[PDB]
RNA sequence: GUGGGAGAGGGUGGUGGAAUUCCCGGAGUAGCGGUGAAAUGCGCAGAUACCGGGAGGAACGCCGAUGGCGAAGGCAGCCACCUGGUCCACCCGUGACGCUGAGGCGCGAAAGCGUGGGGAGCAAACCGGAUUAGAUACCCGGGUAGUCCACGCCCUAAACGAUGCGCGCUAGGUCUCUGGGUCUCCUGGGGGCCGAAGCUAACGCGUUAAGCGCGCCGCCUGGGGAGUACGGCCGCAAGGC
């Protein structure tokens, strides 16, 4: 799973400035995170259909905060989606 | 139905994470291999529950009995 | 890596130069499968509740470890490899919980 | 002609049926009985009555054979399995323990429709 | 975000004992079995009952609950690994990013279809034995698909709380699962029960609303004809919408 300096390491990599746990790149990131970690488990474990739920979720929550950034700020948008390698 | 006293009351702290210890868990099964109840184990929901794979765990290792045969019927 | 306990019931009718044997072949194999031991208890020769193998009684032992998850399961099979080993249960080692406390 | 005289008795009791065996200390069997050994041919043979008739059949086979002192093992739950107990105690052959070992699964196979709602 | 937690939530690999069937071996003899009573059936080629050994399939006693988890179908031995959801405390971060949701897409008990496996127990169909006026049926003995596994279809249901999702408000009492706490108690979140107000045709519901509101979707408009006909679409078919 994501131990805890994995998931510390990315949000010290996306934060926006010290302290920021919360920011909407943060989350993105986080997110992507744990999708592709999910997605990978779910390439073998083609059967488990509970997991892959959750995951349309996971997913569902990223493409809405998208939406959001790139309603608010153009800019850093795309700037977050360059730097996730995302989309497409 | 089973009414004298809750097995805890008269044990010491004891662990009941550890499937090692057969002499604290034997007292906790019945005349036959059956694992006791509430009315007698007197344990809570949550230290019952433990109990449970505790002992399953003791007996896979070959520690605990899995059945018994009751004397003097 | 992570905090594992593994246990080993064993024939009790080896003598030395055998029970040396399994010893080296176990301690081998944890070395192996990359798993840094911590504490061993050694508790020999017990009475067993229902026979396994055939045997009443059992040999025990029981290895506090660490190791690299992934590889948890198969270090198991490897351990269990040997005619002489009668039962492995490798469990994730975690906390006490108490009553009567 | 072995000459036992410490032994088994294991009284299996149906609801058809009940049948007795006396078997030597190691499981070897002896003597027998059951309800249609002595007379009883139908449903009759799982009476208390034939329960008596065969325990004390079998114990009387028994002492026949030499056997004294029996260790009792009670399998099954039929109308005078406990008779089959009482004749074994009133036998004459000195019944060391009754000891209950009915069989039962750890939910292991599907029943027939009679006895359904297990597994 | 951090730090705690409970859990038959899911997927994969391994492993455990009880029981049944079957085979091998010891001992043992005249029945066992089954029913309302019976018979078919099995049994001197030695059955049942008893001991020891082997093989294989399937389910998981006690714990077990009025319990738990899950969106629903549904989930129960134990272990490891992969993984989902969720609760609480701290009041740390972002700053309305929200709710619902026709289409679409995905899941979806059981039975059923395809192709390979597997097959112990049970078992539609079927073969018999009985019972009755007759017996097809119920009751008894056999037994095939199937039940199990992999991959792919099928999309139904009393898929039920017969109660769409979200939020806010409106007495309490009692029981309980699980967090936090100044731990008889208080506080959060689940599961039940009784009852204010209110609602309801009644029965009942009543902070787990069927109350008072607002948002959004689905649906209803006498009964039979009918989930029929025709048309379309899906489906290997069965058949579904
Ligand atoms: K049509
Ligand atoms: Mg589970
Ligand atoms: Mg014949
Ligand atoms: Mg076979
Ligand atoms: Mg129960
Ligand atoms: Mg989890
Ligand atoms: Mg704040
Ligand atoms: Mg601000
Ligand atoms: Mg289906
Ligand atoms: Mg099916
Ligand atoms: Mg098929
Ligand atoms: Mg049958
Ligand atoms: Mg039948
Ligand atoms: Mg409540
Ligand atoms: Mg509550
Ligand atoms: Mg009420
Ligand atoms: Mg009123
Ligand atoms: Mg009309
Ligand atoms: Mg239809």
Same mark, same amino acid.
């Given at each position: 799973?994501?131990?805890?300096?994995?998931?510390?390491?990315?949000?010290?990599?996306?934060?926006?400035?010290?302290?920021?746990?919360?920011?909407?790149?943060?989350?993105?990131?986080?997110?992507?995170?744990?999708?592709?970690?999910?997605?990978?488990?779910?390439?073998?474990?083609?059967?488990?259909?509970?997991?892959?739920?959750?995951?349309?979720?996971?997913?569902? #929550?990223?493409?809405?905060?998208?939406?959001?950034? #790139?309603?608010?700020?153009?800019?850093?948008?795309?700037?977050?989606?360059?730097?996730?390698?995302?989309?497409? | 139905?089973?009414?004298?006293?809750?097995?805890?009351?008269?044990?010491?702290?004891?662990? %009941?994470?550890?499937?090692?210890?057969?002499?604290? %868990?034997?007292?906790?099964?019945?005349?036959?291999?059956?694992? @006791?109840?509430?009315?007698?184990?007197? %344990?809570?929901?949550?230290?019952?529950?433990? @109990?449970?794979?505790?002992?399953?765990?003791?007996?896979?290792?070959?520690? @605990?009995?899995?059945?018994?045969?009751?004397?003097?019927? | 890596? /992570? !905090?594992?306990?593994?246990?080993?019931?064993?024939?009790?009718?080896?003598?030395?130069?055998?029970?040396?044997?399994?010893?080296?072949?176990?301690?081998?194999?944890?070395?192996?499968?990359?798993? /840094?031991?911590?504490?061993?208890?050694?508790?020999?020769?017990?009475?067993?509740?229902?026979?396994?193998?055939?045997?009443?009684?059992?040999?025990?032992?029981?290895?506090?470890?660490?190791?690299?998850?992934? !590889?948890?399961?198969?270090?198991?099979?490897?351990? !269990?490899?040997?005619?002489?080993?009668? !039962?492995?249960?490798?469990?994730?080692?975690?906390?006490?919980?108490?009553?009567?406390? | 002609?072995? &000459?036992?005289?410490?032994?088994?008795?294991?009284?299996?009791? $149906?609801?058809?049926?009940?049948?007795?065996?006396?078997? +030597?200390?190691?499981?070897?069997?002896?003597?027998?009985?059951?309800?249609?050994?002595?007379?009883?041919?139908?449903?009759?043979?799982?009476?208390?009555?034939?329960? &008596?008739?065969?325990?004390? +059949?079998?114990? *009387? *086979? =028994?002492?026949?054979?030499?056997?004294?002192?029996?260790?009792?093992?009670?399998?099954?739950?039929? =109308?005078?399995?406990?008779? =089959?107990?009482? =004749?074994? &105690?009133? $036998?004459?052959? &000195?019944? *060391?323990?009754?000891? +209950? +070992?009915?069989?039962?699964?750890?939910?292991?196979?599907?029943? *027939?429709?009679?006895?359904?709602?297990? $597994?």
């Amino acid at each position: 799973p994501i131990t805890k300096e994995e998931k510390q390491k990315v949000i010290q990599e996306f934060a926006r400035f010290p302290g920021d746990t919360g920011s909407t790149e943060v989350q993105v990131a986080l997110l992507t995170l744990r999708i592709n970690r999910l997605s990978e488990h779910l390439k073998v474990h083609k059967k488990d259909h509970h997991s892959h739920r959750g995951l349309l979720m996971m997913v569902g #929550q990223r493409r809405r905060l998208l939406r959001y950034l #790139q309603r608010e700020d153009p800019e850093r948008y795309r700037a977050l989606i360059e730097k996730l390698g995302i989309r497409g | 139905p089973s009414r004298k006293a809750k097995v805890k009351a008269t044990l010491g702290e004891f662990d %009941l994470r550890d499937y090692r210890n057969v002499e604290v %868990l034997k007292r906790f099964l019945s005349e036959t291999g059956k694992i @006791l109840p509430r009315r007698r184990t007197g %344990l809570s929901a949550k230290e019952q529950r433990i @109990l449970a794979k505790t002992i399953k765990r003791a007996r896979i290792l070959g520690l @605990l009995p899995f059945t018994e045969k009751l004397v003097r019927k | 890596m /992570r !905090r594992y306990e593994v246990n080993i019931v064993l024939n009790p009718n080896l003598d030395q130069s055998q029970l040396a044997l399994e010893k080296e072949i176990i301690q081998r194999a944890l070395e192996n499968y990359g798993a /840094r031991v911590e504490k061993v208890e050694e508790l020999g020769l017990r009475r067993l509740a229902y026979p396994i193998a055939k045997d009443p009684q059992g040999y025990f032992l029981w290895y506090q470890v660490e190791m690299p998850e992934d !590889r948890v399961n198969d270090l198991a099979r490897e351990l !269990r490899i040997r005619d002489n080993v009668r !039962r492995v249960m490798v469990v994730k080692s975690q906390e006490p919980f108490l009553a009567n406390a | 002609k072995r &000459q036992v005289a410490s032994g088994r008795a294991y009284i299996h009791a $149906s609801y058809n049926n009940t049948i007795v065996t006396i078997t +030597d200390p190691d499981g070897n069997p002896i003597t027998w009985s059951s309800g249609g050994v002595i007379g009883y041919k139908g449903s009759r043979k799982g009476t208390p009555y034939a329960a &008596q008739l065969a325990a004390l +059949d079998a114990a *009387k *086979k =028994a002492m026949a054979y030499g056997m004294q002192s029996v260790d009792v093992i009670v399998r099954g739950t039929g =109308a005078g399995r406990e008779q =089959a107990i009482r =004749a074994l &105690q009133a $036998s004459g052959l &000195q019944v *060391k323990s009754i000891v +209950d +070992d009915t069989p039962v699964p750890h939910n292991g196979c599907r029943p *027939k429709k009679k006895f359904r709602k297990a $597994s």
